[PDB]
Structure formats: C-alpha cells, structure tokens
Symmetry: C2
C-alpha cells in the first residue's frame, strides 16, 4: 500500500517534468522567432575542461560556430561588459551557472541584470536554495538544466535557435 503513494508521487514528478520541458521549449521558440558567430559561452576557469569542452564538442558537430577560449571569467571584471561584447560577435550567449561561477562573488545588480532576450543561462550542478542565495530573481526564472537533459540533447535544443 506504501508503494501506491510512491507511484502517485512518481506520476506527479513526471507531470511536472513534462511541464518544465514544455516551458523551456516554448521560450526558445519565442526566442528564435524574435552576427558572424552563433554562440559565445561565459564560464569559470574550473568549468572549462569539465563541461564546456563537452558542450562545444557537441555543438560543433551539429555545425555550430563557437569560441570559448575567449570568454573565460577571471572574476576580476564586470559581467555586463563581458556579455555585451559577446552579443556584438554572436547571435546568442550562454552562461554556465555553477558553484565555480558563483564563487567569483559578483555584484548583486549584475546577476539581477542577467535576465525577447538573447542570453541563455545553463544550470550546472547547483541547488535551488544555492542559486536563490546569490540572486533570488535569477533562481526564480527558468533556464536550461544539466540535471534534466544530456549534453547532446541540450546541444540540439540550442541548435533550434539558429
């Protein structure tokens, strides 16, 4: 009888997951509907070899043009000026939201300013409470998750913007 409630929870979790995938796909459709390069990707020094390499390896196979060596954050400058120089070069921009990213200690106003738009944040190995601590607004809104989709699926989803 105890398993039945686990089944009910299972069904609820499944419906919620369905709604979430629908939401992000609907926002990307509105984003595409609304530059020499396709994407640029802002990340920390620690995430570069770990996740970013795999993502650009995934996107370049689909035929996307990216450059990630340029946009490594040293945590010594403004986030705004780093995302605007990339919007001048690329069609879209990606920010990898991780523990290494939040450890740089960025001004609240800039994180509040990260949120049609051409910028797409990707949650990588973070909890909701943790993101809510640095900026509750950034955590409240929707973004891509590495906990929900594989790197390859994420790459296809991004490629739908071009």
């Amino acid at each position: 009888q105890a398993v039945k409630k686990v089944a009910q929870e299972q069904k609820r979790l499944s419906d919620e997951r369905t709604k979430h995938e629908a939401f992000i796909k609907q926002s990307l459709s509105s984003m595409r509907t609304t530059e020499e390069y396709d994407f640029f990707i802002s990340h920390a020094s620690e995430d570069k070899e770990a996740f970013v390499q795999d993502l650009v390896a995934a996107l370049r196979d689909l035929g996307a043009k990216i450059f990630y060596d340029a946009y490594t954050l040293k945590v010594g400058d403004s986030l705004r000026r780093k995302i605007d120089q990339g919007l001048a070069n690329s069609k879209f921009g990606i920010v990898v939201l991780s523990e290494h990213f939040f450890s740089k200690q960025w001004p609240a106003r800039e994180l509040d300013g990260l949120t049609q738009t051409r910028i797409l944040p990707i949650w990588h190995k973070v909890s909701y409470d943790e993101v809510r601590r640095f900026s509750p607004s950034l955590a409240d809104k929707v973004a891509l998750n590495t906990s929900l989709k594989s790197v390859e699926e994420i790459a296809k989803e991004l490629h739908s913007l071009i």
Copy 2:
C-alpha cells in the same frame, strides 16, 4: 516504526541532509540518518533492506560524493527495482555524469534539488506520510 530513512555519503550530511532532516522533523515526521550514513565499503542493497524494515519509506541522495563511492552497477540499477518503495533525490549532479554510473537510474525521474527547495521537497515527501 519510523516514517523515512535517508542514506547518504558522509560528505553531504552537513550540507544537505541536516537541512532536510531538520525540515522533515519540523513537519512532524520521525526519521533517522546517523545510522544510515554509508562508508566506501558497504552493500547498498542490504543497507536499504535494513532501512525498509525500521521505516516505511527510503531516501537515497544522489550526489558527486555518493557516486565517488564506486558502487557496483548492479546495485545502482537495482535501486530502480518490481514494486518500488525507495525515493532517490538528485542533488547537484549532472545527467551525463549519472549515466556514467547508471543509465537506468539517469532516465528514471526523481526529486531534483535544482527544481524545488528543501522545504518544498520536505512537503512533497510529507505527502506520502
């Protein structure tokens, strides 16, 4: 008997487990966790079997520290199965890196701390009484 039991790595007990146990105790549920913290040399399947006997439901928290303990593949793929009384919780872990250990566990949907808050996960767990 107890309501839940929550197995976990020794590293996540102060970061997430203490918070969840606190939240679930604030909701009137009785759970125990210090007895079900696992060492690198353990049998996952037998440990959960001890857990389903002194409590009604079981919780496994899937984190980098949990996977750093190299469990057998058969014991992660067995978390899934058959009637199921166990509830996995994803905490700060990537999809692809779960696949490295168990694809069957990665395709199964579970509670995700990147989606809900600890208080929200607590309520959502309390719905099972």
